Design a protein around this ligand. Structure first.
Ligand SMILES: [Mg+2]
Ligand SMILES: [Zn+2]
Ligand SMILES: [Zn+2]
Lengths: 106, 339, 54, 88, 451, 124, 274
């Protein structure tokens, strides 16, 4: 008799629960996927802005981003989502790539 | 009326590195640029009070733009009009055969389209300022617009009044809630007191249901009521005093209440009876005291706002004479003392 | 290469040369079709040496 | 990978349309992409199926990208590092 | 003003009349297609439902063809129709409820122990004809499906044969309470009363451009709808003239073939390898790609591919102008399209417009934030693909070496790289596309290199 | 031999390039090529080819009903045909052949409801 | 090609978690990918040289008699225990297979034999003089390295705090603990110095980290590709029996392999024919 939209309830908003630093279970080494995504995001955002702390001068966003990662200057964080509780929580681990092991990206 | 609201939204960030240099300031600026002065979720936003809750700046994931986004929960000052509300100023711009078009001045931006009837297209003309009476759930806040679309009718004070039956006491915490409305009446009173005597007197005599032989209606300091031949054997009861006493639990709120057209709509006075003796054309409504109190304070606030707004609109006598047609149009709907 | 205008003032139903390498017009004829209607008949020719990838 | 997928339910399921229905019944979009969309779609509408978006085929049929590979982990901006090192 | 979002779930449901009436943006009334250049308002080409022409905007959203996705319209039917997809659901709903009062005739507390999506099916499976109702005391007739078509039902009452018109079926189903629906297996949104339609949906024009043959079927269906009387009412056992019986069948047969004709149909677009799902959704047609024959070159490294110069001036790489790359991008801009390596287009961020490099102003300059589309040079990365793509080395990333001899048209590689693609040099062809985006270029080099 | 660039003739229905060299369109990255790119984890390349170079579009959805909405920045429209005062519209990245697929599911009287991802908030 | 598409659709939802498990959206398919959590591009084939020895050959080769201390009796007992556990497990595997013979050759993330010798050649020292304190320190570092090995599956934060390890992650380090105790026995590490052995251990842990499977990898697609390729050189009725899960009555080449009741009557062919 009614429309489907009437009985539809939008998903309730969630809370971000951050696992404390001494309870983190995942690895302190970046995966090749995570390092690749970090460099790609940083390179596009340098194609937008251009401001960096990397002292040496390069003519490409990709070179700047790669050297920022290797020299531990990249201004990004990695969020690893562990679980979504059905009381409306999002339990995550935040990892700092400036303090992590970096894979071999020849 | 003006109150608070809590909104949730997602903001696209086109330059995350710059945005994250000062998150709070940039966030407030962008919220103000998007939402100030517009309709959103059945309301109209006036100011951004503050940001209650926010998320980190996530990088967009489904495209290669490198752009950010943020979830924001912010508190805003909004102005939601009630059904059958009463506005004091409007300039009719468009006066055609189909519709009558105007805009409000002294409150928030609202556009009122009066259905053009055969008795109204001949009276209201462009340039005039009239009081308007709103209707039920007609104030639709279309999101993304700068005004509230609403239909209204020319305000002529009514000759009828409603009686509600109260059978339950007013408890202390409902009074604690109603303290805000009491305080709003108080600040309206202290604002009205600064205004000129002659303006408020002329407007009160105009918008009183009946007519009096001058200088017998108003006691701004004491609020003693109309000194008309002692029409009722019971003195009008001040609502504010009754609430202040029922704070300490000294009087009972049970029985029949009413506000007759002779009773001054602005003043906090009202009538209470243990029996139904009111000459009301409509059946009394059986209910609890909380709704009686909320409705009566809303009515008092609306009428104080209307009288303040009438005085604030017409700061000169020249404009009053320029709009006097509306004045005698109201005057001919007054009821004389032939009773 | 073949111009064609169709009365509706006009819409241009012409023909382009959509190929990567240039050709040379070898023969142009205007014979009569099965319905005795005039239709254009173009022959293009190419100079082909043996080249890398053949 | 084959053995553990075919036995994860405590029974032996196939690598055909029947086994896909036994292991992932609520994934209407994945099962439509395999064998017979109209029959799968008709059953989904009658049961009022709720289909969460995960894996490969369900995000693709919805016009999106799978949350996989370089897209598995979220990236957020380091506010405490930018505000201390960068300038407006 | 619209924030970024992602879809987390999809819910499937049966659409009723109210859904169609609420979603629709217009109501189709007339059968006229075109009044002039513009479509005939009120017809099945009305521009309130989108635009498939590049001259007028959509009335609803005020977008051009590319940004308008289309909006549906409503046709109010003169006589109700059955839903073509859920005929079996209709059939199996008639055998479990009373034709006169709507209470169920089966034992509700006999199937509650099974899982919900099977108990209604099992209940209908059990024989019920000849049973008698318990609240109104009516005998449940035999329900017999015709063999001559796909939608009609006959009610056989001990030799009394009735044809169940959709008005009758809707009236029957409207008497069923929500308790029966909930406890008989289905959910609240699967009420049987939505299985009879009095207002159908007209799909947006974006799904039927080419003003296709699905447009003919709609136009017939609209025309023959007007022949039915505006207030024809049918009762159980009521005699109707044979023209109306022929008319009503024609409309229902048209609506059935509009959706399930030999599964032009809406639903025949979905299934096969050339269908919507496997061709349009699971695969793609892409721009900025090249194809050629492969040949050997022993002076190339294993992670290099030789690229013809003509292909390198056709495919481009997009470079955003900043302070750190302005001097390096200036030589490309000056060469234009007349010397190699050059460029083809510039996107100006102050105007949001793309200009060709030859047909370009003389007072033009490269500003920070403009995007230059330059040629492919030595050292660019490229995806190299050979089909069929059976393993994950079937696509690899090579460093481009541009072959500047204008007489060469082949993709060249080292012979020791052929093991990645299972290829040789007797006439094989491989695909090659060059990433132009910064994000796609980073992950080509760090993730997908052939090492 | 064949090579094409970022523009050319397009299909009228799906929005994708036409088929191959004969029609001056694009070349096909089929089902088997998407399996290979997903096995590699190259997801930013799938965006560039199947969205930026094929038929990517932007879809507008209402939070409250899950139904497609109408959004237009220039000549501003912000509307939902189902709620119309509670319209909370979010922009999702889609592609045109997927939206055509969902209209075809609705034409056969199947209602599609899109549940958007919930908003997330850092505590206090 | 037809069998490839049905394998791909049945397996494509399997993806590596943040625990290195394999799940379909939440539902576990494997507790650890490949039961060892490794990438197949990062394996080397290595020989375990204790499996085939007898207890007198093992007594001679791997038991150290240089220093008379109980710690060198404990070291040799583990070499025996690892040998017997290996024998027991892979002898059993032979029993539920038709013809799957035991081997002493395994695929491992790290080749420890090659790491040690490449350091013996590139050292500035020769045959070190005897120092029992040096040999006692080298024993303790190898013992502590094996005890902390499963933390390669968690991180260095939990290794510092010495939190408990799940049992399924203790099992995952079994082959590498076994190989490290063989190739780093005292009889083999006599000329390696203490600051050299620290270099060896820091290299083994680095290479072990580099061979683990990445979070978010589509390992079900990788499996479908890798198994449909050998089917080309074979799509006959038997594969379709396995992958369709057909019942017993529909089998066309069903077999069995029965053993005789006694290992003293197996040797007579005439008895078996009876
Ligand atoms: Mg060949
Ligand atoms: Zn449109
Ligand atoms: Zn909505």
């Amino acid at each position: 008799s009614p429309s489907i939209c009437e009985g539809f309830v939008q998903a309730s908003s969630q809370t971000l629960v951050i696992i404390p630093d001494n309870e983190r279970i995942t690895s302190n080494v970046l995966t090749t996927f995570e390092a690749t995504r970090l460099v790609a995001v940083r390179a596009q955002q340098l194609a937008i802005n251009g401001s960096t702390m990397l002292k040496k001068k390069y003519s490409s966003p990709i070179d700047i981003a790669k050297q920022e990662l290797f020299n531990r200057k990249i201004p990004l964080l990695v969020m690893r989502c562990i679980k979504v509780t059905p009381e409306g929580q999002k339990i995550v681990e935040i990892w700092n790539p400036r303090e992590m092991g970096i894979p071999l990206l020849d | 009326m003006i109150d608070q609201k809590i909104f949730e939204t997602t903001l696209n960030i086109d330059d995350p590195t710059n945005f994250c240099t000062n998150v709070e300031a940039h966030l407030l600026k962008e919220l103000e640029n998007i939402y100030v002065g517009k309709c959103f979720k059945n309301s109209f936003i006036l100011n951004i009070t503050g940001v209650i809750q926010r998320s980190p700046c996530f990088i967009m994931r489904t495209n290669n733009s490198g752009r950010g986004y943020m979830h924001v929960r912010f508190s805003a000052v909004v102005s939601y009009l009630n059904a059958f509300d009463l506005i004091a100023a409007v300039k009719i711009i468009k006066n055609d055969s189909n519709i009558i078009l105007g805009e409000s001045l002294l409150t928030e931006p609202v556009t009122i389209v009066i259905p053009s009837s055969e008795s109204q297209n001949n009276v209201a003309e462009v340039g005039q300022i009239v009081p308007v009476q709103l209707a039920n759930s007609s104030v639709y806040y279309i999101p993304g617009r700068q005004q509230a679309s609403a239909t209204g009718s020319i305000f002529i004070p009514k000759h009828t009044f409603s009686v509600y039956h109260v059978q339950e006491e007013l408890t202390q915490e409902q009074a604690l809630n109603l303290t805000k409305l009491v305080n709003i009446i108080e600040m309206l009173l202290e604002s009205r007191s600064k205004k000129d005597f002659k303006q408020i007197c002329f407007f009160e005599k105009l918008y009183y249901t009946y007519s009096i032989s001058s200088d017998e209606i108003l006691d701004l300091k004491i609020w003693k009521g109309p000194k008309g031949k002692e029409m009722s054997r019971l003195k009008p009861c001040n609502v504010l005093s009754f609430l202040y006493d029922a704070l300490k639990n000294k009087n009972s709120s049970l029985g029949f209440w009413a506000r007759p057209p002779n009773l001054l709509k602005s003043s906090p006075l009202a009538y209470q009876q243990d029996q139904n003796s009111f000459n009301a054309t409509e059946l009394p409504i059986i209910c609890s005291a909380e709704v009686m109190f909320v409705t009566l304070l809303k009515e008092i606030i609306n009428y104080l706002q209307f009288i303040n707004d009438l005085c604030d609109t017409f700061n000169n006598e020249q404009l009053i004479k320029r709009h006097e047609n509306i004045w005698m149009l109201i005057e001919q709907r007054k009821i004389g003392h032939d009773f | 290469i073949i111009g064609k205008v169709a009365k509706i003032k006009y819409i241009d139903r012409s023909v382009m040369y959509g190929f990567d390498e240039p050709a040379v017009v070898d023969a142009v004829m205007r014979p009569h079709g099965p319905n005795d209607e005039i239709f254009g008949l173009m022959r293009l020719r190419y100079e082909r040496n043996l080249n890398i990838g053949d | 990978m084959y053995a553990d997928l075919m036995t994860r339910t405590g029974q032996v399921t196939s690598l055909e349309k029947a086994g896909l229905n036994a292991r992932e019944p609520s994934n209407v979009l994945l099962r439509m992409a395999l064998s017979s969309p109209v029959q799968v779609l008709t059953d989904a509408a009658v049961d009022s199926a709720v289909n969460p978006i995960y894996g490969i085929a369900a995000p693709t049929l919805m016009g999106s990208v799978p949350r996989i590979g370089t897209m598995y982990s979220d990236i957020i901006m380091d506010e405490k590092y930018i505000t201390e090192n960068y300038k407006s | 003003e619209a924030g970024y979002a992602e879809i987390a779930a999809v819910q499937f449901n049966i659409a009723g009349d109210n859904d169609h009436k609420r979603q629709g943006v217009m109501e189709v009334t007339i059968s006229n297609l075109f009044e002039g250049t513009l479509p005939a308002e009120g017809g099945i080409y009305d521009a309130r439902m989108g635009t498939t022409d590049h001259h007028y905007k959509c009335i609803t959203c005020s977008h051009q063809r590319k940004q308008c996705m289309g909006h549906p319209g409503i046709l109010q039917m003169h006589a109700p129709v059955l839903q073509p997809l859920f005929i079996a659901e209709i059939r199996r709903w008639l055998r479990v409820i009373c034709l006169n009062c709507g209470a169920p005739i089966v034992d509700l507390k006999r199937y509650e122990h099974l899982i919900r999506p099977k108990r209604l099916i099992e209940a209908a499976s059990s024989q019920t004809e000849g049973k008698q109702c318990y609240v109104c005391k009516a005998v449940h007739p035999k329900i017999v499906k015709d063999s001559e078509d796909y939608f009609t039902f006959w009610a056989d009452q001990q030799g009394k044969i009735d044809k169940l018109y959709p008005q009758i079926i809707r009236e029957i189903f409207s008497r069923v309470t929500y308790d029966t629906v909930v406890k008989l297996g289905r959910s609240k949104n699967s009420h049987p009363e939505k299985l009879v339609l009095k207002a159908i949906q007209i799909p947006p024009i974006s799904i039927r451009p080419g003003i296709h043959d699905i447009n003919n079927v709609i136009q017939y269906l609209v025309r023959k709808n007007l022949l039915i009387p505006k207030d024809l009412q049918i009762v159980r056992g009521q005699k109707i003239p044979l023209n109306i019986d022929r008319n009503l069948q024609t409309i229902q047969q048209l609506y059935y073939n509009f959706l399930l004709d030999s599964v032009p149909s809406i639903m025949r677009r979905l299934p096969r390898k050339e269908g919507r799902i496997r061709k349009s959704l699971l695969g793609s047609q892409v721009w900025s790609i090249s194809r050629s024959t492969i040949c050997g070159n022993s002076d190339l490294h294993l992670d290099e591919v030789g690229y013809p110069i003509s292909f390198a001036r056709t495919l481009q790489v997009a470079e955003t102008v900043q302070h750190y790359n302005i001097n390096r991008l200036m030589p490309y801009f000056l060469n234009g399209k007349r010397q190699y390596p050059g460029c083809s287009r510039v996107y100006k961020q102050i105007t949001q417009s793309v200009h060709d490099i030859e047909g370009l102003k003389q007072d033009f300059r490269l500003e920070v934030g403009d995007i230059l589309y330059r040629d492919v040079v030595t050292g660019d990365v490229a995806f190299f693909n050979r089909q069929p793509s059976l393993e994950r080395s079937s696509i690899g990333v090579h460093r481009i070496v541009v072959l500047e001899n204008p007489k060469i048209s082949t993709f060249q590689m080292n012979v020791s790289a052929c093991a990645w693609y299972n290829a040789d040099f007797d006439g094989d062809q491989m695909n090659l596309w060059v990433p132009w985006s910064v994000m796609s270029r980073v992950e080509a080099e760090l993730l997908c290199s052939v090492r | 031999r064949y090579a094409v660039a970022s523009y050319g003739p397009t299909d009228a229905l799906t929005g994708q390039p036409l088929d191959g060299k004969r029609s001056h369109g694009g070349l096909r990255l089929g089902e088997m090529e998407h399996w290979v790119l997903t096995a590699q984890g190259a997801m930013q390349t799938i965006i560039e080819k199947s969205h930026d170079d094929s038929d990517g579009c932007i879809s507008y959805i209402c939070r409250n009903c899950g139904e497609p909405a109408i959004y237009n920045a220039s000549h501003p429209i912000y509307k939902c045909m189902n709620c119309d005062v509670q319209a909370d519209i979010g922009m999702v990245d889609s592609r045109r052949s997927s939206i055509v697929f969902q209209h075809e599911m609705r034409a056969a009287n199947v209602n599609i409801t899109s549940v958007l991802s919930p908003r997330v908030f850092q505590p206090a | 090609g037809y069998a490839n598409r049905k394998a791909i659709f049945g397996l494509q939802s399997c993806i590596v978690d943040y625990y290195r498990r394999v799940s379909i959206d939440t539902r576990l398919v494997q507790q650890l990918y490949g039961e060892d959590g490794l990438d197949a591009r990062q394996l080397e084939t290595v020989r375990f040289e204790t499996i085939m020895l007898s207890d007198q050959e093992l007594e001679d080769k791997f038991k150290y008699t240089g220093i008379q201390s109980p710690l060198f009796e404990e070291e040799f007992s583990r070499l025996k225990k690892d040998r017997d556990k290996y024998r027991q497990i892979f002898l059993n595997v032979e029993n539920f297979n038709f013809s799957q013979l035991l081997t002493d050759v395994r695929q491992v993330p790290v080749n420890v034999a090659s790491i040690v010798k490449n350091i013996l050649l590139s050292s500035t020292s020769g045959v070190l003089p005897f120092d029992e304190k040096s040999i006692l320190q080298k024993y303790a570092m190898v013992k502590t390295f094996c005890k902390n090995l499963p933390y390669v599956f968690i991180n260095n934060i939990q290794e510092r705090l010495q939190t408990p390890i799940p049992v399924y992650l203790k099992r995952a380090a079994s082959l590498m603990r076994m190989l490290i105790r063989i190739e780093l026995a005292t009889v083999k590490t006599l000329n390696i110095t203490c600051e050299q052995m620290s270099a060896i251990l820091d290299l083994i842990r680095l290479q072990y980290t580099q061979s683990l499977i990445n979070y978010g990898e589509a390992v079900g697609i990788l499996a479908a590709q890798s198994v449909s390729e050998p089917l080309t050189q074979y799509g006959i009725v038997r594969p379709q029996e396995i992958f369709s899960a057909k019942p017993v009555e529909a089998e066309q080449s069903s077999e069995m392999l029965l053993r005789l009741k006694n290992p003293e009557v197996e040797t007579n062919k005439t008895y078996a024919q009876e």
